[PDB]
Amino acid sequence: TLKYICAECSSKLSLSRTDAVRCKDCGHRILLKARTKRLVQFEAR
Amino acid sequence: MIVPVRCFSCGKVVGDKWESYLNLLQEDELDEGTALSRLGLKRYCCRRMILTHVDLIEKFLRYNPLEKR
Amino acid sequence: EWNVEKFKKDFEVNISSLDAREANFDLINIDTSIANAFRRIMISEVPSVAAEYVYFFNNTSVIQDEVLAHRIGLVPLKVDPDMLTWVDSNLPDDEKFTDENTIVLSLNVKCTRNPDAPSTDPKELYNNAHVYARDLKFEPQGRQSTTFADCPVVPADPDILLAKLRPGQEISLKAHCILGIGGDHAKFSPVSTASYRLLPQINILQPIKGESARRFQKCFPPGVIGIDEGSDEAYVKDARKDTVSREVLRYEEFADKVKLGRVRNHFIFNVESAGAMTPEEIFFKSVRILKNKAEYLKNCPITQ
Amino acid sequence: EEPDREKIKLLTQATSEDGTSASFQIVEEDHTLGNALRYVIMKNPDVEFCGYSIPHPSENLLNIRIQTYGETTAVDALQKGLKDLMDLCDVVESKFTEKIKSM
Amino acid sequence: KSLQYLGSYIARAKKLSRTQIIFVASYLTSWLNRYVIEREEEVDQRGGMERFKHFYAAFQALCYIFCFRHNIFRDTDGNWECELDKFFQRMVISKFNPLKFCNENVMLMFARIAQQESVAYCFSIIENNNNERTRQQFIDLQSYFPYDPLFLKNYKILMKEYYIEWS
């Protein structure tokens, strides 16, 4: 499931459209995106 | 950041001995060099990785973006 | 006049010490051109197992993607070669990793806070905060249900500190392994320090007995010069205990009464280990790779 | 039977048809075999000249030259330079196994 | 290339006269013995064997006449046109070694016919090449036989009447 991160209270809340760009456990504005299980590959050099 | 795996010049694996100097001064209670001698301490082409390392990963981990407070 | 029969009658090996990591054995009357090449091959050309391609399905902690991808490749895996075989990069991705060319590893760790009371030991304070090397778990791919059953792929020093974590964070990866020369990258290196040192030889000229002999004792490593009295004045105990400091060559009293030299064919190999192989065995690999390199030119015809 | 003809190449822009003077361009090599091979060739007394030179360390090439007095070509001197270096790597090993077993 | 075109022309042509074969090889032996006076003691000067590229490709193309057209050269008795166990048997042991500088395949066909035909005995000298053995594009002309069989399944039906096969 796509969710995001509240930068302030550290509570992972998702975001649908026609919604406030806010937190909802605190009242914070700036909000950052988390990652999920996705394949990335690297050389060990 | 964390302790390097391999000695840069020589190449001995040095992710091994980072942890015995509190107990060298709390359990063994010595001064510096007596505690800097015994436990497998051998070459000042890689004895630096005791004295030289900073281990800045402790200062990052307090900035967790994933926990309350 | 040199013939290979005559090499055989004056070549000696003095294996002074032979441990499970750091072997130390002397040689006699071989040229430096051969003896460097044994040092040359033991660093580069003896192959070893190392992690090559790291697939992170999830990396969340503070140690970044590419840094921890680099550290896993450095991990010396206690698996003898001539179990895997080489990779061959003239064929695509889904054909490049088989059951025969690739030990397949994986690592899954999540950290969460343990209820504890405090000033608090950060092992007791968080579950799985240290990611040691002994959390890397071998996954048996293909026919590897009995052909690595006696020897599961264990990191040769299982106390390598791969990461530190905090609650919320996780690292979920899958790292393949491969067999490769050390001449490409410095993680395939099957030796800590492959080195030879050339044996010093100390020449005295005058009798230097008495009070002077005590200041010829102390200007060297202690197991080098032995005094009895003027009877047995100052004999060389060990020319191997001494390394070249030349402490005696800055004094006035011994400015000319002693000279220093090297025995120009008596090597002293030191061969440490990477933790995968015994050190005398990687010296056997080196002396046959050069023989593998000698026959292969002979088995090669000259076209133009 | 599949030859691998990349590894030897006799540069005919330096080789006379006397055979006593030639110039081999090895690939995939370095100082590792070169000094070790050249020391073996210089014990054959019919070899008047033998030296190696890596042209440039970036590419993995190797050039050795052998001149002889006659009555042995560079190729008949190259092979005995390789025929002995096989045996010289066995006199090391066979002397070495016999010293492990006495501990 | 033209001599290389000429050599695999004769032995890969069903419809010629049995004296049109001769005059080609009559001239092609005439040129190699017009060749004897001039450039058969110029060999040992300071130069290379690549001076004579024109020679060996001609003698290659002459050997490919004899390889798959030899019984036409057979006269009533079994003798040869201008004594080919004296013409070839000189140039087998000449001061060029043309046994070495022609193609390896067609010279292998030559001695493995001249053994079973008694014109030359050059299998010893091809064996006598042990230690001594602009080149890469000189192989590629000597292996270019222009009259190889057609792999395409449809036009050889026409050329099943004008052409000699590998048999």
UniProtKB/Swiss-Prot annotation, chain A:
Gene Ontology BP, a term: termination of RNA polymerase I transcription
Keyword flag Transcription: yes
Location within or outside the cell: Nucleus, Nucleolus; Peroxisome
A GO term, aspect molecular function: DNA binding
PTM annotation, UniProt: The N-terminus is blocked.
Zinc finger map (C4-type): 6-26
Entry GO CC: cytoplasm; nucleolus; nucleoplasm; nucleus; peroxisome; RNA polymerase I complex; RNA polymerase II, core complex; RNA polymerase III complex
Residues binding Zn(2+), per UniProt: 6, 9, 23, 26
Record keywords: DNA-directed RNA polymerase, Metal-binding, Nucleus, Peroxisome, Ribosome biogenesis, Transcription, Zinc, Zinc-finger
Note: Present with 907 molecules/cell in log phase SD medium.
Assembly notes: Component of the RNA polymerase I (Pol I), RNA polymerase II (Pol II) and RNA polymerase III (Pol III) complexes. Component of the RNA polymerase I (Pol I) complex consisting of 14 subunits: RPA135, RPA190, RPC40, RPA14, RPB5, RPO26, RPA43, RPB8, RPA12, RPB10, RPC19, RPC10, RPA49 and RPA34. The complex is composed of a horseshoe-shaped core containing ten subunits (RPA135, RPA190, RPB5, RPO26, RPB8, RPB10, RPC10, RPA12, RPC19 and RPC40) where RPA135 and RPA190 form the DNA-binding cleft.
Name of the protein in its database record: DNA-directed RNA polymerases I, II, and III subunit RPABC4
Lineage of producing organism: Eukaryota, Fungi, Dikarya, Ascomycota, Saccharomycotina
Full protein segment contained here: 26 to 70 of 70
From Swiss-Prot, chain C:
A GO biological-process term: transcription by RNA polymerase I
Database matches in InterPro entries: DNA-dir_RNA_pol_30-40kDasu_CS, DNA-dir_RNA_pol_insert, DNA-dir_RNA_pol_RpoA/D/Rpb3, RBP11-like, RNAP_Rpo3/Rpb3/RPAC1, RNAPI/III_AC40, RNApol_insert_sf, Rpo3/RPB3_RNA_Pol_subunit
TM ranges: none
Matches recorded under Pfam families: RNA_pol_A_bac, RNA_pol_L
A GO CC annotation given for this chain: nucleoplasm
Coiled coil regions, renumbered to chain: none
Function (record text): DNA-dependent RNA polymerases catalyze the transcription of DNA into RNA using the four ribonucleoside triphosphates as substrates. Common component of RNA polymerases I (Pol I) and III (Pol III) which synthesize ribosomal RNA precursors and small RNAs, such as 5S rRNA and tRNAs, respectively. RPC40 is part of the polymerase core and may function as a clamp element that moves to open and close the cleft.
Miscellaneous comment as given in the Swiss-Prot or TrEMBL entry: Present with 13000 molecules/cell in log phase SD medium.
Name of the protein: DNA-directed RNA polymerases I and III subunit RPAC1
Organism in which the protein naturally occurs: Saccharomyces cerevisiae (strain ATCC 204508 / S288c) (Baker's yeast)
Taxonomic path: Eukaryota, Fungi, Dikarya, Ascomycota, Saccharomycotina
Protein's gene: RPC40
From Swiss-Prot, chain D:
GO terms of molecular function: DNA binding; DNA-directed RNA polymerase activity; protein dimerization activity
Any one GO biological process: termination of RNA polymerase III transcription
Position(s), cross-link Glycyl lysine isopeptide (Lys-Gly) (interchain with G-Cter in ubiquitin): 95
Coarse class of the protein's main subcellular location: nucleus
GO-annotated cellular components: nucleoplasm; nucleus; RNA polymerase I complex; RNA polymerase III complex
Complex and partners: Component of the RNA polymerase I (Pol I) and RNA polymerase III (Pol III) complexes. Component of the RNA polymerase I (Pol I) complex consisting of 14 subunits: RPA135, RPA190, RPC40, RPA14, RPB5, RPO26, RPA43, RPB8, RPA12, RPB10, RPC19, RPC10, RPA49 and RPA34. The complex is composed of a horseshoe-shaped core containing ten subunits (RPA135, RPA190, RPB5, RPO26, RPB8, RPB10, RPC10, RPA12, RPC19 and RPC40) where RPA135 and RPA190 form the DNA-binding cleft.
Family in the record: Belongs to the archaeal Rpo11/eukaryotic RPB11/RPC19 RNA polymerase subunit family.
Note: Present with 8680 molecules/cell in log phase SD medium.
Name this polypeptide is given: DNA-directed RNA polymerases I and III subunit RPAC2
Lineage, broadest ranks: Eukaryota, Fungi, Dikarya, Ascomycota, Saccharomycotina
Residues of the full protein shown: 40 to 142 of 142
Curated annotation (Swiss-Prot), chain E:
More details: Present with 138 molecules/cell in log phase SD medium.
Summary of subunit composition and partner proteins: Monomer. Interacts with NOP53.
Native species: Saccharomyces cerevisiae (strain ATCC 204508 / S288c)
Residues of the full protein shown: 419 to 614 of 627
Gene: RRN3
Subcellular location: Nucleus
Protein role: Required for efficient transcription initiation by RNA polymerase I. Interacts with Pol I in the absence of template DNA and stimulates recruitment of Pol I, but does not remain as part of stable preinitiation complex.
Top-rank taxon: Eukaryota
Annotated family: Belongs to the RRN3 family.
Coiled-coil annotated spans: none
Protein name, per record: RNA polymerase I-specific transcription initiation factor RRN3
